[PDB]
């Protein structure tokens, strides 16, 4: 186990909407849970976009998950992560 580094970014603001992306990088092994939460409740699969769990080239893995939200409601959305028994929650940066 290598603990994942988590970074949350905002991008592609348009039409009152914005994309929030949660990136988990340089973790091992490949098995990881990554999902957006809304008021603490996990979003379904169909409302999120999923990156593959891919090797770094440094012997670890990385992935990402993104979802499209209304600009202004960022505080209600958090990125949730479970990796080999440990869990964490990260907010959208403000």
């Amino acid at each position: 186990t290598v603990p994942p580094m988590v970074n949350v970014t905002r991008s592609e603001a348009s039409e009152g909407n914005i994309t929030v992306t949660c990136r988990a990088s340089s973790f091992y092994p490949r098995n990881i849970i990554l999902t957006w939460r809304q008021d603490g409740v996990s979003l379904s699969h169909d409302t999120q976009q999923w990156g593959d769990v891919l090797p770094d080239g440094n012997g670890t893995y990385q992935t990402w998950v993104a979802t499209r939200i209304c600009r202004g409601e960022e505080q209600r959305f958090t990125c949730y992560m479970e990796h080999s028994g440990n869990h964490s929650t990260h907010p959208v940066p403000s």
Partner: antibody
Amino acid sequence: EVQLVESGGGLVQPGGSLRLSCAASGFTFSTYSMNWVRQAPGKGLEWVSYISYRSRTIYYADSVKGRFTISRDNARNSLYLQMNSLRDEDTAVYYCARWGYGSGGFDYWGQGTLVTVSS
Amino acid sequence: EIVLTQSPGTLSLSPGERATLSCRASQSVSSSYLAWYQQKPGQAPRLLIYGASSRATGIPDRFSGSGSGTDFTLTISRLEPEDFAVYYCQQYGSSFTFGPGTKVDIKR
């Protein structure tokens, strides 16, 4: 003051169907996720179904998936539960419950409505 | 599925004493996703504690919560006769489930 008022329960035949409703007031309804929670007679609480404030995320307990449908009409401050193929184990008081902003929890509950499934 | 168990099943205590209620999760639940509810006999439940330790609106200070991982605690210091109720813990780490509840009776 936040108020949620359920209605529509009653006696129904096994295999029958029944529609529950919940009328909300005192807050901007279209901005809160909503839930149904039930309590069988003398029994514990059992979460039933969840719907997000724009109906994009919906969940059901395994014991009702395929038989119950949750929905909402934000313009009428209303939450619905359509119940089909009812069974005896569906007999309960059904509570309407609001989901708390940011930090979650069932932060307000309706008064409950009783559904009895029997022939 | 995450299953919540609660101990003790029933708790009989005199007014002014301290009630200690336990909740156990079949797997790790983050503290943000653990809540506690109070339900008096003829009533709907009401939210007591959210995020394991935060008091909900209008909840007096004698109600307190703590815990993390798989073990959580609700403390009611200085019991009152009206505190007679069933207390349920609830998680939404994964889906939404309730513990079976602990009945708290008043001794007299």
